[PDB]
Each structure stands twice: as C-alpha cells, then as structure tokens.
Ligand SMILES: Nc1ncnc2c1ncn2[C@@H]1O[C@H](COP(=O)(O)OP(=O)(O)O)[C@@H](O)[C@H]1O
C-alpha cells in the first residue's frame with residue numbers, strides 16, 4: 001500500500017540525514033565558472049536534463065554559483081557569452097546545509113522559500129590546523145521526496 | 153510537524169482524484185504542432201521553465217505529443233526545424249488518465265515506468281449522439297507530491 005510506504009518514509013525523516021540521500025559530488029553534473037556559453041556548451045547543459053547545474057572554480061568542491069537551464073533562454077550562442085556574465089546577472093542564491101541535518105528539518109527548509117537545492121558540507125576538524133567546510137554533494141527536495149515515497 | 157502533514161496527505165490519496173490536483177488546460181503552457189523551432193520559439197520554451205510542454209493540433213484540447221526541453225539540446229535554431237521533425241524523432245509516449253482516477257492509483261502508476269505526466273480526460277456523455285473523451289488538463293507526479301507534503 002502506498003499509504004504505509006509514505007508513512008514509514010515520513011517516520012524516517014526524523015533520523016535520516018541529508019548525507020544519506022544527497023547526490024555526492026562525484027555523481028554531480030557541474031560546470032566550470034570559466035565556461036563559455038557557445039552552442040556546444042549550452043547543448044551539453046540541455047542534454048544533461050538537470051534543471052540546475054552547480055558552477056565551480058578551480059576544484060569541483062569549490063561551488064561558487066548555480067546555473068539554471070532557464071538562464072540560457074535569452075543567450076544567443078553566437079555571442080560566446082562567458083558563463084560569468086550570466087551568473088553575475090541572475091545571481092541565484094546558493095544555499096548550504098550541514099551533512100548531519102535531518103531530513104525533516106531539510107524538508108521544512110525547502111518548503112519555506114523558493115530554493116529546492118542545497119550544497120551539503122561537513123566541518124573538517126582533522127587538520128592540519130584550521131577547521132574548514134568540506135563540500136560533499138548536493139541535496140534537493142526530490143531527494144527527500146524520493147525517501148518519503150519509495151517502496152521499502 | 154512534517155510527519156503528521158505527510159500522513160494526513162497520505163490518507164487523502166484514497167479519496168482525492170487527479171481532477172482535484174491537475175493543472176487545468178487553461179493554465180497549461182503548450183505549443184502548436186505547427187511551430188518552428190527557430191530561436192525565439194526555443195527561447196520562449198526555455199523561459200517557461202517547464203520540463204515538458206504538451207503539443208496540440210488545431211484546438212488546445214487536441215493534445216497529440218509531448219515536447220521535452222531536453223529535446224532541443226541538439227537543435228540548431230538557424231535550421232528553423234519544424235517541431236514535427238522533433239516530435240517524430242523522439243516520439244515521447246503520451247499517457248492519458250481519467251479524471252476520476254484516485255491519487256493513490258495515480259501515484260502507483262507514476263512509480264512504475266518512466267512517465268511522470270498524464271493528460272487528464274473525462275468521458276463526455278452529454279451528446280449530441282456519440283460519447284467522446286474531453287481533455288481537461290495535465291497531472292504530474294509533482295501535483296501528487298504536493299498534495300502529500302503541503303501544510304494543512
Ligand atoms: N546538476 C546535477 N547533477 C547531478 N545530479 C543532480 C543535479 N541536479 C539535481 N540532481 C539530482 O537529481 C535527482 C532529481 O532531482 P531534481 O531536484 O528533480 O532535479 P532535476 O529537475 O534537475 O531532475 C536528485 O537525486 C538530485 O540530487
């Protein structure tokens with residue numbers, strides 16, 4: 001029964017974390033901040049099928065922006081517009097969440113406000129001196145939904 | 153509490169129908185089968201923000217195909233390719249559902265198979281002779297999810 005599946009998923013939202021359901025960084029389709037939005041680049045982005053694509057600088061873990069596919073709607077590929085022009089214009093908010101965040105809290109946070117994607121990070125204390133934020137992956141509302149409705 | 157919201161939504165899936173949650177036809181962003189995928193047309197489709205766009209012929213209620221935004225990934229706007237070339241190539245399946253279908257059944261049907269959009273229709277017996285299928289709107293998995301998780 002659908003109803004009991006959902007209810008069990010609902011009960012697990014208290015104890016599961018965003019880290020449990022996230023798309024880890026090595027499974028993310030991302031794009032370098034240096035990119036040029038020529039025809040082939042926009043074509044790869046549309047082929048990927050994702051609504052939103054993290055933008056990184058230098059290393060994949062250094063996520064600095066989010067590119068939405070809808071941000072290419074007025075881009076003429078003939079212009080070879082740098083991606084930077086587009087991320088500076090739209091400036092989509094970039095939200096971060098800790099890996100130990102519980103899915104009930106995450107769901108609450110996605111339900112309030114427009115953003116349904118957060119970058120998952122943890123505090124890396126295993127220095128090497130200074131503690132820093134280590135980016136692990138992304139988590140969206142759909143990751144949480146899937147945990148609620150999936151068969152188990 | 154998130155958990156009780158979800159559980160109540162789950163309990164209502166038995167009695168709510170696809171008609172209760174659908175996007176009615178007058179609220180749908182659609183495209184005519186005659187369209188040409190020149191730059192401005194592809195630009196309107198990407199600006200709309202929808203992953204999938206019903207294609208109609210003649211009247212809005214005569215839905216004959218579904219265009220996915222990802223189907224424009226290799227389309228060069230300079231070619232002025234008719235939309236028909238693209239819908240004949242990809243041929244995305246078009247699924248129909250009756251308006252009195254319950255959301256638990258709908259959710260079951262979206263969970264099995266790739267399609268997460270159905271065209272909602274009802275049997276129009278108020279002829280005028282012959283009974284026909286009257287298209288009312290579309291319903292996607294997200295419409296059902298929203299009914300499960302929304303605050304109430
Ligand atoms: N750029 C991306 N790279 C890889 N996976 C992604 C990306 N964006 C979203 N996802 C993942 O895809 C799944 C579906 O998420 P959803 O938010 O519906 O995104 P989309 O609409 O782009 O499919 C989730 O597991 C989510 O973490």
Ligand SMILES: Nc1ncnc2c1ncn2[C@@H]1O[C@H](COP(=O)(O)OP(=O)(O)O)[C@@H](O)[C@H]1O
Pocket residue numbers: 174175179180181182201202203204205206290291292293294295
């Ligand atoms: N072409 C469209 N026109 C209008 N509404 C649509 C269209 N496609 C989906 N929707 C509606 O948008 C809401 C979100 O659905 P979803 O399946 O997430 O589509 P999308 O990824 O395109 O936002 C639902 O209420 C759904 O019925």
